């Protein structure tokens, strides 16, 4: 009994630490997300200004966009909790070889199998896709946004120059980030419920 | 019995109520019930798209 | 309409959230009173010891 | 008489231990219950938002819901008193074979 | 716990909101949302050519 | 989050640690009572001597 | 028997309980359960990096 | 920019430094409580003496 | 390297064997205290035999 | 959450505690005879050695 109890207090502390780790991830994804908001604006007025401005001015807008991208890769390659990068592809949700997932199995109780798994995946190449992102589309749409000089070639009807495709994949990246954040906040709620359960078990 | 007061539940209760006050401050200082991602996930994503 | 909707999601009824703030404080401090009274029984046990 | 008495003190301690076991179950069911409150909210605004939002946003709400579910199975598969899971189907109220209750 | 209030987030929050007010003054005293080069780069360069 | 984590490690639940403080004091003083009663038997042995 | 009270165990017990109170003061005066390096070593090193 | 930089060096986050001020006061006064309780054990030793 | 599924790296195996060691120590202590009770009963029996 | 390094630190604490286990099992003596060690294996393979 006593061993169980002390491991339950330690279980409370464990889950609290897990919540904190997540909160780090959620500050990071928050800032990344705000970046994608700014990017979306730049893509919309890249939309109009592809029919008002020149390819030069679109190169300037592109300079701003690529800078924001380098911040995305930055946050995904600096965000660490206990020196372990969370956002990078370390914890691919489903590796082709499932052995490589390296899933975040936090301790939640004081006995065997009383754990919960977690996954994170986000970087520059966090755009549309199936298993990999894709090639010319859907990976660079977050890394190298097409509004360079390409965008003046066509309106929406190439699927790799088109306005509609590009913007759709921006909103896709925003959808993946928002989904990730939603999952993580859900984990925080779960862990809260677990702390209460452990508190009653300690009682 | 002396090693165990029954009012340890007042300490878990007190930590819980304190945590409530903490969320309250984080909502009042921010004016946002979605201040942290947690505590409303779906509402966040909706509000974000 | 969408800034309104976002607001209805994201923002706080800060009046209500303050009444809640007050409330949670009173519950905390009340629990603290109960702790203060809780730590007075073992001393009575000691009075029984001597 | 003396044997009865000492077994009555032990009977008091027994029932107290039983109460405690139950209190564990009731903390667990308390948290599960609060989860179902949150779920109910998510189903109501799933109600409206099924006529405001898209199927995508309903997939996001669903992600939150399924997470809460995994917490339900979690509590039902972690709640133990003396290492014995209480909430799970171990103690089905009326097994088809009543021997298995 | 006493070494760490949870409301340190109210201090980061307060510094952020103050910084917001600072940008507000720099826009209202100047009447320019491009007062500093930052906060709109592309819009600047467009407005400059 | 890291100041929070450090705090969860380093800091004290000083309410709980005070209830513990009280408790340990009562156990000490109770043991002292038991000492006071313990030093009363040899004198009864002396009463038996005379 | 007079050279040896059984309640010497009350003196070892009393020294132990006193030592408990001593740790309690060192935690309450400091607000730190890692006040001394001892009593949590791993938690210290984690908290220190 | 240089007055800003100097300020970021020299000045104080006086809100934060006040929360710290409060904190250090509470730690002092708490240590004082622990002293008050600490000076109560020798008197119990005296009770054991008589 | 692994969560629970090697039986010599796994969490569950390791912790299970910690609780096993605690079980062996607790069993030993229980036996020994039982011996103390037994010996007490024997002292009383010997006291009556001396009577 | 932590790295293999921090687990090496935790391990240092654990191995220390172990060396205390072997310590108590190799110092616990009554009339200079070690009790806890494998001297009194509950059932030796050769029961003569118990």
Residue numbers in the entry:
A (entry chain V): 52 to 254
B (entry chain A), E (entry chain K), G (entry chain L): 3 to 51
C (entry chain A), F (entry chain L), H (entry chain B): 255 to 304
D (entry chain f): 52 to 152
I (entry chain r): 204 to 254
J (entry chain r): 103 to 152
Provide passages from the article that reported this PDB entry:
There are three parts to the flagellar structure: the trans-membrane basal body that functions as the motor, the connecting rod and hook, and the flagellar filament that acts like a helical propeller. Our current understanding of supercoiling in bacterial flagellar filaments, referred to as polymorphic switching, is based upon the notion that protofilaments within the flagellar filament can exist in two discrete states, that differ slightly in length. The “short” state results from a protofilament having a right-handed inclination (the R-state), while the “long” state results from a protofilament having a left-handed inclination (the L-state). To reconstruct filaments at high resolution, all protofilaments must be “locked” into the same state, either L- or R-type, producing straightened filaments that lead to non-motile bacteria.
While the three L-type mutants (E115G, S285P, and S17P) have a left-handed 11-start helix, the four R-type mutants (N226Y, A233V, H84R and A39VN133H) have a right-handed 11-start helix, and the designations L and R correspond to the hand of these 11-start helices. The L-type 11-start helices are tilted left by ~ 1.7° and the R-type 11-start helices are tilted right by ~ 3.9°. Strikingly, we found those sites are not necessarily conserved among different species or participate in unique inter-subunit interactions. These include three straight mutations outside of the D1 helices: S17P, S285P (both within D0) and the double mutant A39V/N133H (within the loop region). We also identified several straight mutations that are only involved in the 11-start interactions: S17P, H84R and A39V in the double mutants. We calculated both FSC plots in the A39VN133H dataset and found that the model:map FSC (4.3 Å) is similar but more conservative compared with the map:map FSC (4.1 Å).
